[PDB]
Amino acid sequence: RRQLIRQLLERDKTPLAILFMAAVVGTLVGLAAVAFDKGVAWLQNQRMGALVHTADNYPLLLTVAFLCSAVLAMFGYFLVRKYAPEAGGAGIPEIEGALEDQRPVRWWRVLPVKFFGGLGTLGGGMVLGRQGPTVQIGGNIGRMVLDIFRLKGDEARHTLLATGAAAGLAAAFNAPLAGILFIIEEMRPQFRYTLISIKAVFIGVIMSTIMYRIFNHEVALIDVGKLSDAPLNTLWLYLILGIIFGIFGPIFNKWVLGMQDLLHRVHGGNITKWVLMGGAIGGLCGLLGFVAPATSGGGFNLIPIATAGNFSMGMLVFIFVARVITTLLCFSSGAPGGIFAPMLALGTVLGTAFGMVAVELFPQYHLEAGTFAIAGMGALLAASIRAPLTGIILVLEMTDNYQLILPMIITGLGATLLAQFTGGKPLASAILARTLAKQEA
Amino acid sequence: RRRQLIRQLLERDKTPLAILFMAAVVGTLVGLAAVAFDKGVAWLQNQRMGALVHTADNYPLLLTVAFLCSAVLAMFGYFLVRKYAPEAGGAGIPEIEGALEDQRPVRWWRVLPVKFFGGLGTLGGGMVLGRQGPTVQIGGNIGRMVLDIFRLKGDEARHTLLATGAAAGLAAAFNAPLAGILFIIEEMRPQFRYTLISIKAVFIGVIMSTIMYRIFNHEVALIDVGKLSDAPLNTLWLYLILGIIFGIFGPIFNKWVLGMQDLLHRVHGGNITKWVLMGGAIGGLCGLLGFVAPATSGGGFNLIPIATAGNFSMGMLVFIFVARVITTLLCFSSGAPGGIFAPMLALGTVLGTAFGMVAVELFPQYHLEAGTFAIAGMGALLAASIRAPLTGIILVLEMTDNYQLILPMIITGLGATLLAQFTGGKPLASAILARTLAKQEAEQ
Amino acid sequence: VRLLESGGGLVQPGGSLKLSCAASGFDYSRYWMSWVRQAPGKGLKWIGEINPVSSTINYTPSLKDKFIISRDNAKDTLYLQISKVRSEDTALYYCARLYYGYGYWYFDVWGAGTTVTVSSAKTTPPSVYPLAPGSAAAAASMVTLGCLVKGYFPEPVTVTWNSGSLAAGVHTFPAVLQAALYTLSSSVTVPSSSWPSETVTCNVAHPASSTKVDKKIVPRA
Amino acid sequence: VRLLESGGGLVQPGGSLKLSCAASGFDYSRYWMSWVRQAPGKGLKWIGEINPVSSTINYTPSLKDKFIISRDNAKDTLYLQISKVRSEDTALYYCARLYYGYGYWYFDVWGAGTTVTVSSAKTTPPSVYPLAPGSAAAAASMVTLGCLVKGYFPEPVTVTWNSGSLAAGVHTFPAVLQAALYTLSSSVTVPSSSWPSETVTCNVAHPASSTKVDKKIVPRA
Amino acid sequence: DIVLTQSPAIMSAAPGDKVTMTCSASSSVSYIHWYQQKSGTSPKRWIYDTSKLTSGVPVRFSGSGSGTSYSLTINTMEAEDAATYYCQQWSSHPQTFGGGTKLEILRADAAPTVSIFPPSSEQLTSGGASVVCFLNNFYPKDINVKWKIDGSERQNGVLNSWTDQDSKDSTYSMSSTLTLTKDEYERHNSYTCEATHKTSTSPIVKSFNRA
Amino acid sequence: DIVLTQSPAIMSAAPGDKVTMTCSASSSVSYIHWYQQKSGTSPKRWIYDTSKLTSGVPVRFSGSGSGTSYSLTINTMEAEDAATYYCQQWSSHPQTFGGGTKLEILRADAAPTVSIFPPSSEQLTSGGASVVCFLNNFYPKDINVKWKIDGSERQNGVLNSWTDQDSKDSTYSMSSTLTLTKDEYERHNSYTCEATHKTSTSPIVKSFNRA
Ligand SMILES: [Br-]
Ligand SMILES: [Br-]
Q: Which domains does chain F have, with CATH numbers?
A: 1-107 (2.60.40.10), 108-210 (2.60.40.10)
Among B33, B215, B238, residue whose Cα is nearest residue B131: B33
Look at the alpha carbons of B295, B296, B302, B305 in this order and tell me if their dihedral is positive or negative. Answer: positive
Determine contact: B218 vs chain C, CB below 8 A.
yes
Cβ pair A363:E93 closer than 8 A = yes
Residue D200, helix vs strand vs coil: coil
Burial (CB count <10 Å: 0-12, 13-18, 19+), residue A302: buried
Chain breaks in chain E (C to N over 2.5 A) after: none
> What is the nearest CA distance from C189 to chain E, expressed in angstroms?
9
CATH superfamily, region D1-120: Immunoglobulins (2.60.40.10)
Residue D156: cis peptide before it, omega within 30 degrees of 0: yes
Cβ pair C102:A309 closer than 8 A = no
Residue D130: cis peptide before it, omega within 30 degrees of 0: no
Hey, which residues does E81 pair with through a beta bridge?
none
Question: Chain B partners of A205 at a C-beta cutoff of 8 Å?
Answer: 410
Q: Using alpha carbons only, how large is chain D's radius of gyration in Å? A: 22
Phi, psi dihedrals of residue A416, rounded to the nearest 5°: -45, -45
- CA separation for the pair D26, D3 (Å, rounded): 10
What residues contact C216, with CB distance under 8 A and at least 6 apart? C130, C199, C200, C201
User: C-alpha distances in angstroms, D60 versus A402, D103, E19, F1, F95?
Assistant: 41, 20, 69, 9, 9
Among D168, D132, D165, D156, residue whose Cα is nearest residue D204: D156
Residue B41 Cα to ligand 2 midpoint, Å, equals 13
Among A380, A267, A279, A292, residue whose Cα is nearest residue A330: A279
- CA separation for the pair A432, C98 (Å, rounded): 53
Do residues B118 and B140 make contact, with C-beta atoms less than 8 angstroms apart? no
Residue C125, helix vs strand vs coil: coil
H helices of chain F, in order, are 121-124, 182-186
Determine contact: A421 vs chain E, CB below 8 A.
no
Please give the residue of chain C at the shortest CA–CA distance from B216. C102
Residue A231: cis peptide before it, omega within 30 degrees of 0: no
DSSP E81: G
List the CATH code of the domain at B1-444. 1.10.3080.10
Among A265, A331, A270, A251, residue whose Cα is nearest residue A299: A331
Q: What is the 3-class SS of F38-88, one letter each residue?
A: CCCCCCEEEEECCCEECCCCCCCEEEEEECCEEEEEECCCCHHHCEEEEEE
User: C-alpha distances in angstroms, A38 versus A44, A123, B30, D161?
Assistant: 10, 10, 50, 52
Question: b vs e for E142-151, b when ≥16 Cβ sit within 10 Å of the residue's Cβ?
Answer: ebebbbebee
- CA separation for the pair A235, A410 (Å, rounded): 8
Burial (CB count <10 Å: 0-12, 13-18, 19+), residue E167: middle
* Domain spans in chain C, listed from the N-terminal domain onward: 1-120, 121-219
Question: b vs e for D50-85, b when ≥16 Cβ sit within 10 Å of the residue's Cβ?
Answer: bbbeeebebbbeeeeebbbbebebeebbbbbebeeb
User: How many beta-carbon contacts under 8 Å exist across A and E?
Assistant: 7
- Determine how many CB atoms are found less than 10 A away from the CB of residue B139: 34
Residue A115 Cα to ligand 2 midpoint, Å, equals 49
Among F60, F72, F64, F67, residue whose Cα is nearest residue F7: F72
Hey, which residues does E162 pair with through a beta bridge?
E174
- CA separation for the pair C142, A20 (Å, rounded): 90
Question: b vs e for A370-409, b when ≥16 Cβ sit within 10 Å of the residue's Cβ?
Answer: bbbbbbbbbbbbbbbbbbbbbbbbbbbbbbbbbebbbbbb
Which class is D121-219 in CATH? mainly beta
What residues contact B288, with CB distance under 8 A and at least 6 apart? B63, B66, B67, B70
Q: Could you please state the CATH topology (level 3) that the domain comprising A1-441 is classified under.
A: Clc chloride channel (1.10.3080)
- Determine how many CB atoms are found less than 10 A away from the CB of residue A238: 27
Instruction: Collect all residues from C whose CB is shorter than 8 A from any CB in A.
Output: 30, 32, 51-52, 55-56, 58, 98, 100, 102-105
Q: What is the CA F13 to chain-centroid distance, rounded?
A: 15
Q: Which amino acid is at E30?
A: S
Query: Kind and range of the H or E element at E41?
Result: none
Residue B24, helix vs strand vs coil: helix
H helices of A51-153, in order, are 58-81, 92-98, 107-124, 132-148
Residue D66, helix vs strand vs coil: coil
- Determine how many CB atoms are found less than 10 A away from the CB of residue F125: 9
Residue B154, helix vs strand vs coil: coil
Hey, which residues does F116 pair with through a beta bridge?
F133
User: C-alpha distances in angstroms, E160 versus A374, B110, C128, C184, E176?
Assistant: 64, 76, 18, 10, 4
- CA separation for the pair B326, B317 (Å, rounded): 14
Cβ pair C102:A359 closer than 8 A = no
Experimentally determined by = X-ray
Determine contact: F199 vs chain D, CB below 8 A.
no
Do residues F6 and F99 make contact, with C-beta atoms less than 8 angstroms apart? yes
Q: What is the CA B402 to chain-centroid distance, rounded?
A: 21
Among A251, A176, A241, residue whose Cα is nearest residue A379: A241
- CA separation for the pair B427, B431 (Å, rounded): 6
Determine contact: B8 vs chain D, CB below 8 A.
no
Instruction: Supply angle C-alpha B231, B234, B239, rounded to 5.
Output: 60
Tell me the Ramachandran region of residue C166: left when phi exceeds 0, alpha when psi lies from -120 to 50, beta otherwise.
beta
Torsion from C-alpha of D186, D187, D188, D192, nearest 10 degrees? 130
CA atoms within 13 A on the CB side of B442: 9
* Residue of D21, D44, D202, D218 to mutate, interface with F, max F Cβ within 10 Å: D44
Q: Using alpha carbons only, how large is chain B's radius of gyration in Å? A: 22
Question: Chain A partners of D102 at a C-beta cutoff of 8 Å?
Answer: 214, 217
Q: Which amino acid is at A243?
A: I
Among E137, D32, F107, A15, residue whose Cα is nearest residue B421: A15
Cβ pair D43:F86 closer than 8 A = yes
Q: Using alpha carbons only, how large is chain C's radius of gyration in Å? A: 21
- CA separation for the pair D18, C220 (Å, rounded): 50
Cβ pair E134:C171 closer than 8 A = yes
Burial (CB count <10 Å: 0-12, 13-18, 19+), residue B258: middle
- CA separation for the pair A383, A247 (Å, rounded): 8
Determine contact: A174 vs chain B, CB below 8 A.
no
Cβ pair A199:B411 closer than 8 A = no
Cβ pair C51:A309 closer than 8 A = no
Question: b vs e for B278-302, b when ≥16 Cβ sit within 10 Å of the residue's Cβ?
Answer: bbbbbbbbbbbbbbeeebbbbbbbe
Residue D154: cis peptide before it, omega within 30 degrees of 0: yes
Question: Chain B partners of C102 at a C-beta cutoff of 8 Å?
Answer: 215, 218
Cβ pair D44:F208 closer than 8 A = no
Instruction: For residue B134, give the ligand nearest its CA.
Output: 2
Look at the alpha carbons of A154, A159, A161, A162 in this order and tell me if their dihedral is positive or negative. Answer: positive
- CA separation for the pair F49, D46 (Å, rounded): 19
Burial (CB count <10 Å: 0-12, 13-18, 19+), residue F155: exposed
DSSP A192: S
Q: What is the CA A295 to chain-centroid distance, rounded?
A: 18
Cβ pair E92:A364 closer than 8 A = yes
DSSP A293: T
User: C-alpha distances in angstroms, D142 versus A242, B239, B434, D138, F113?
Assistant: 80, 71, 102, 10, 11
Do residues E138 and E145 make contact, with C-beta atoms less than 8 angstroms apart? no
What residues contact A124, with CB distance under 8 A and at least 6 apart? A43, A47, A68, A69, A70, A71, A72, A73, A76, A282, A283, A285, A286
CA distance between the termini of chain F: 63
User: C-alpha distances in angstroms, B348 versus A1, B239, B428?
Assistant: 35, 13, 16
User: C-alpha distances in angstroms, B32 versus A231, B162, B215, C15?
Assistant: 19, 17, 10, 58
Q: Which amino acid is at B35?
A: V
Q: Which amino acid is at C25?
A: G
Neighbours of chain E (3+ CB pairs under 8 A): A, C
Instruction: Supply angle C-alpha B360, B362, B368, rounded to 5.
Output: 25
Pairing status of strand F208-209 against strand F172-181: unpaired
Q: Which amino acid is at F135?
A: L
H helices of A362-420, in order, are 369-375, 388-399, 405-420
Cβ pair B364:F93 closer than 8 A = yes
User: C-alpha distances in angstroms, B120 versus B42, B116, B125?
Assistant: 9, 7, 7
Question: Chain B partners of F96 at a C-beta cutoff of 8 Å?
Answer: none
Instruction: For residue A381, give the ligand nearest its CA.
Output: 1
Between chain D and chain F, are at least 3 CB pairs below 8 A? yes
Please give the residue of chain E at the shortest CA–CA distance from A361. E93
